[PDB]
Write an enzyme that holds these catalytic residues in place. Sequence first.
Site, PDB file in Angstrom:
ATOM      1  N   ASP A   1       2.669   3.188   7.400  1.00 41.16           N
ATOM      2  CA  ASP A   1       1.509   2.343   7.101  1.00 41.16           C
ATOM      3  C   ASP A   1       1.885   0.884   6.847  1.00 41.16           C
ATOM      4  O   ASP A   1       1.484   0.295   5.846  1.00 41.16           O
ATOM      5  CB  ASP A   1       0.712   2.910   5.914  1.00 41.16           C
ATOM      6  CG  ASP A   1      -0.507   2.063   5.568  1.00 41.16           C
ATOM      7  OD1 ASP A   1      -1.290   1.765   6.494  1.00 41.16           O
ATOM      8  OD2 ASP A   1      -0.669   1.688   4.380  1.00 41.16           O
TER       9      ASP A   1
ATOM     10  N   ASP B   1       0.805  -1.219   0.000  1.00 40.23           N
ATOM     11  CA  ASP B   1       0.000   0.000   0.000  1.00 40.23           C
ATOM     12  C   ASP B   1       0.845   1.280   0.000  1.00 40.23           C
ATOM     13  O   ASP B   1       0.542   2.244   0.704  1.00 40.23           O
ATOM     14  CB  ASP B   1      -1.008  -0.032   1.167  1.00 40.23           C
ATOM     15  CG  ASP B   1      -2.119   0.998   1.031  1.00 40.23           C
ATOM     16  OD1 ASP B   1      -2.319   1.566  -0.074  1.00 40.23           O
ATOM     17  OD2 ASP B   1      -2.797   1.253   2.049  1.00 40.23           O
TER      18      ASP B   1
ATOM     19  N   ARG C   1      -0.112   9.356   0.774  1.00 42.62           N
ATOM     20  CA  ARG C   1      -0.935   9.370   1.992  1.00 42.62           C
ATOM     21  C   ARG C   1      -0.361   8.466   3.087  1.00 42.62           C
ATOM     22  O   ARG C   1      -0.693   8.632   4.266  1.00 42.62           O
ATOM     23  CB  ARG C   1      -2.384   8.958   1.680  1.00 42.62           C
ATOM     24  CG  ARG C   1      -2.540   7.506   1.282  1.00 42.62           C
ATOM     25  CD  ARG C   1      -3.994   7.040   1.074  1.00 42.62           C
ATOM     26  NE  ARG C   1      -3.955   5.695   0.505  1.00 42.62           N
ATOM     27  CZ  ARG C   1      -3.855   5.418  -0.794  1.00 42.62           C
ATOM     28  NH1 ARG C   1      -3.848   6.393  -1.699  1.00 42.62           N
ATOM     29  NH2 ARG C   1      -3.772   4.159  -1.196  1.00 42.62           N
ATOM     30  N   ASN C   2       0.496   7.523   2.690  1.00 42.38           N
ATOM     31  CA  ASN C   2       1.030   6.492   3.588  1.00 42.38           C
ATOM     32  C   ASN C   2       2.504   6.655   3.964  1.00 42.38           C
ATOM     33  O   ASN C   2       3.112   5.770   4.562  1.00 42.38           O
ATOM     34  CB  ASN C   2       0.750   5.104   3.017  1.00 42.38           C
ATOM     35  CG  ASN C   2      -0.712   4.715   3.141  1.00 42.38           C
ATOM     36  OD1 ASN C   2      -1.402   5.151   4.060  1.00 42.38           O
ATOM     37  ND2 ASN C   2      -1.190   3.888   2.220  1.00 42.38           N
TER      38      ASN C   2
HETATM   39  O1  LIG Z   1       2.238  11.363  14.050  1.00 39.80           O
HETATM   40  C1  LIG Z   1       1.706  10.181  13.641  1.00 39.80           C
HETATM   41  C2  LIG Z   1       0.374  10.142  13.225  1.00 39.80           C
HETATM   42  C3  LIG Z   1      -0.180   8.932  12.807  1.00 39.80           C
HETATM   43  C4  LIG Z   1       0.598   7.777  12.809  1.00 39.80           C
HETATM   44  C5  LIG Z   1      -0.031   6.457  12.356  1.00 39.80           C
HETATM   45  C6  LIG Z   1       0.423   6.078  10.944  1.00 39.80           C
HETATM   46  N1  LIG Z   1       1.258   5.112  10.575  1.00 39.80           N
HETATM   47  N2  LIG Z   1       1.370   5.090   9.338  1.00 39.80           N
HETATM   48  C7  LIG Z   1       0.626   6.030   8.767  1.00 39.80           C
HETATM   49  C8  LIG Z   1       0.419   6.413   7.446  1.00 39.80           C
HETATM   50  C9  LIG Z   1      -0.451   7.474   7.234  1.00 39.80           C
HETATM   51  C10 LIG Z   1      -1.060   8.092   8.332  1.00 39.80           C
HETATM   52  C11 LIG Z   1      -1.944   9.156   8.138  1.00 39.80           C
HETATM   53  C12 LIG Z   1      -2.251  10.011   9.197  1.00 39.80           C
HETATM   54  C13 LIG Z   1      -3.136  11.072   9.016  1.00 39.80           C
HETATM   55  C14 LIG Z   1      -3.722  11.281   7.764  1.00 39.80           C
HETATM   56  C15 LIG Z   1      -3.423  10.430   6.704  1.00 39.80           C
HETATM   57  C16 LIG Z   1      -2.535   9.372   6.890  1.00 39.80           C
HETATM   58  N3  LIG Z   1      -0.801   7.658   9.585  1.00 39.80           N
HETATM   59  N4  LIG Z   1      -0.028   6.716   9.798  1.00 39.80           N
HETATM   60  C17 LIG Z   1       1.927   7.810  13.235  1.00 39.80           C
HETATM   61  C18 LIG Z   1       2.483   9.024  13.649  1.00 39.80           C
END
Ligand SMILES: Oc1ccc(Cc2nnc3ccc(-c4ccccc4)nn23)cc1
Length: 275
Positions: free
Chosen positions: A152, A134, A138-139
């Site tokens: 992600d 994926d 966005r990831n």
């Molecule tokens: O400061 C952080 C915030 C969220 C995460 C969790 C996480 N892990 N992998 C991913 C990939 C994308 C997104 C994400 C977040 C908001 C909007 C769109 C995508 N979040 N995410 C980790 C640290």
Amino acid sequence: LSALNPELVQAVQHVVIGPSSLIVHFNEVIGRGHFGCVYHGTLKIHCAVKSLNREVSQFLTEGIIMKDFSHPNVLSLLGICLPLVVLPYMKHGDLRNFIRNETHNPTVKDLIGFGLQVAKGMKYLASKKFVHRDLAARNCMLDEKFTVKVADFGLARDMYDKEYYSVHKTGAKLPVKWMALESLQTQKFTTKSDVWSFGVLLWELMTRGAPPYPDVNTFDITVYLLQGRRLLQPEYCPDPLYEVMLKCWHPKAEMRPSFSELVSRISAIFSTFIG
Ligand SMILES: Oc1ccc(Cc2nnc3ccc(-c4ccccc4)nn23)cc1
């Protein structure tokens, strides 16, 4: 239970965070996935804490495997709180939103650089025989130094933007507009299908976060691609970088460049720019 684990027992002590060490702030949301919300936390270091709602043996092994991954362009796992997934805080959030944000203005060189950092993160992951499945803007996420990290994956895996996932016969929710032709056909994923997704990610970077194939609907993407079509060259995309994208989208998976080759080719293009 340590008996349920393989010979990874000695690694459990390193992946587990004691609940006394972690403060989690449930009044401030920094992400909404399908499996749960993610919150600000304090571990003293700033962190992101992922909730999981909307085998414990297997959950721990996944965490153990994930924590062992360490690269500046790959999001790390700080640990698990017995559960809560504890991740490094990413000040500048996901890469797609960052490039769409009119607050900042990366130059073409900056954008290619984000691309290069992703390529290095994926080169690392590929060397560990890990298929992402994926990869998309966005990831990926940015930290305080604007360091891009492939995210992600592992225990952080989720659908963070539900709009871009389509329900299949299989029922699987698939990021069809980022998927390689063969993956759309077989639903198998390989490092070579990650390379296809990487090409789409480069296109996202060069368009500052435009949605790919807007006038194509869901699974009709296979039909669209088989007509002899690819995403068009963005205005400020250098010719050699578009050639790189077209290589990432080679009809024969095995003919697509490795991530090692992508790092090489992109570092060269990056080096031609100033500012
Ligand atoms: O400061 C952080 C915030 C969220 C995460 C969790 C996480 N892990 N992998 C991913 C990939 C994308 C997104 C994400 C977040 C908001 C909007 C769109 C995508 N979040 N995410 C980790 C640290």
